[PDB]
């Protein structure tokens, strides 16, 4: 089997991408944030505290003839940005782009943190990291991809995120028309539960490539590119007037600037992020100070190849017995 679904930016900045997901019988379609940095499929629901729902579409398990309470199971998650959610668990039928999993754990939110309530466009998350990170207790549950894997034509999914445009998540096949050149594959460590890999270096604009190992995670659920402070300083030094602002929370730059590209290495291959992809717009409405899309990871504990980096590539998440990642230009 295969599936293919379009993913759409939630706003004009590409802050996140939403993909329609069918849950239950009859289907209830919710727009979920596919997140290769986590491993829970959780949704706003009829159980979510009413004051914490503001415009999201909810899953109502009592209206699904295939929903079953997973007795005794609870979940609770905290994300790298400080947001969180928690609740109980149902199993139900879940379909993405024509690919159907029966008995998928659907984690129903009883509580969500304010950042989720305040974003009416995201109805929940669909985790695509390794199932070892799933938070369901006392019986850990499998991700949608883990459940689908054995049925897929090939045990892979691909992310093809658009810049200011829709893109595609495919399951079970590699669309050879969706990229240019060849796909370069690189080793993955699953020891932390992430799609963790080592970039071979970087370049700023037309500058020389610096060969240096940068360990990080491929994370579709993170907006920006978070890299070591040395790398980030080297980038922003090429933008007149750019500076790190403690009050704003990262590098800002004059909105009048033209940003240089940023290249990262994948083996001997190179992925070029155009400068425009690094512009996240005014820090507040009407400001002439703009927020940068490349930021320091120093306060995180891990480097993160988020959407800024991934949307410059066609990315293969190869879930074979020994997983690997593939990157192609597009």
Swiss-Prot record:
Residues 17-328 form the Peptidase A1 domain. Disulfide bonds join 255-290. Keywords: Aspartyl protease, Disulfide bond, Hydrolase, Protease, Signal, Zymogen. It catalyses: Hydrolysis of proteins with specificity similar to that of pepsin A, prefers hydrophobic residues at P1 and P1', but does not cleave 14-Ala-|-Leu-15 in the B chain of insulin or Z-Glu-Tyr. Clots milk. The keyword Coiled coil does not apply. Its EC number is 3.4.23.22. One of its GO terms (biological process) is proteolysis. It comes from the Eukaryota. One of its GO terms (molecular function) is aspartic-type endopeptidase activity. It is an enzyme of class 3 (hydrolase). The active site is at residues 35, 199. Belongs to the peptidase A1 family. This is Endothiapepsin. It comes from Cryphonectria parasitica.
